[PDB]
Amino acid sequence: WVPPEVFDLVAEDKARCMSEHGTTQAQIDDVDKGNLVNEPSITCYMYCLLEAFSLVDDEANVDEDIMLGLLPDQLQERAQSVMGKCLPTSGSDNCNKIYNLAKCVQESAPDVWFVI
Ligand SMILES: [Cl-]
């Protein structure tokens, strides 16, 4: 997890989402080291990618079933647990909703919130 196959299937959406939002790979790496700031270039990137895979709707409500279904078996209990705490999402906008969600997951259970 993330399994290598996923990276090829996400490549085009990753590229578009970074281009749309001004995202750098260094920002993604930061999020993945647990450093998250409320900067739209990274927060809107995370929303963009979740939306590309139908994990969120037009108001950044999470499809928890689809999200669960994407994760490895050994993470799913921990993920369900973190989502019971961290959903529903709230924020000033779709990007900020996902930032708050990312914080909440990082604060509660580190290894769940990985961002491709
Ligand atoms: Cl939600």
Q: How many CB atoms lie within 10 A of CB 81?
A: 13
Q: What is the DSSP string of 20-88?
A: HHT--HHHHHHHHTT-----HHHHHHHHHHHHHTTSB-TT--B-HHHHHHHS-HHHHHHHHHHHHHH-S
Please tell me the number of Cα atoms within 13 Å of 47 on its side-chain side.
25
What is the DSSP-derived secondary structure letter of residue 93? S
CA of 23 to the centre of ligand 1 (A): 24
CA of 62 to the centre of ligand 1 (A): 4
CA of 89 to the centre of ligand 1 (A): 4
Domain boundaries, given as residue ranges, for the chain? 1-116
CB under 5 Å of ion ligand 1: residues: 61-62, 87-89
Q: How big is the CA angle at 76 (ends 74 and 79), to the nearest 5 degrees? A: 125
CA of 107 to the centre of ligand 1 (A): 17
Please give the single-letter amino acid code of residue 74.
Q
- Under 8 Å between Cβ of 41 and 23: yes
From CA 35, how far away is CA 15, in angstroms rounded? 22
The gap from C-alpha 63 to its chain's centroid, in whole angstroms, comes to 12
41 phi/psi in degrees, rounded to 5: -60, -30
- Under 8 Å between Cβ of 78 and 90: no
39 phi/psi in degrees, rounded to 5: -105, 120
At the topology level of CATH, where does 1-116 sit? Recoverin; domain 1 (1.10.238)
Is the bond preceding residue 2 a cis peptide, omega within 30 degrees? yes
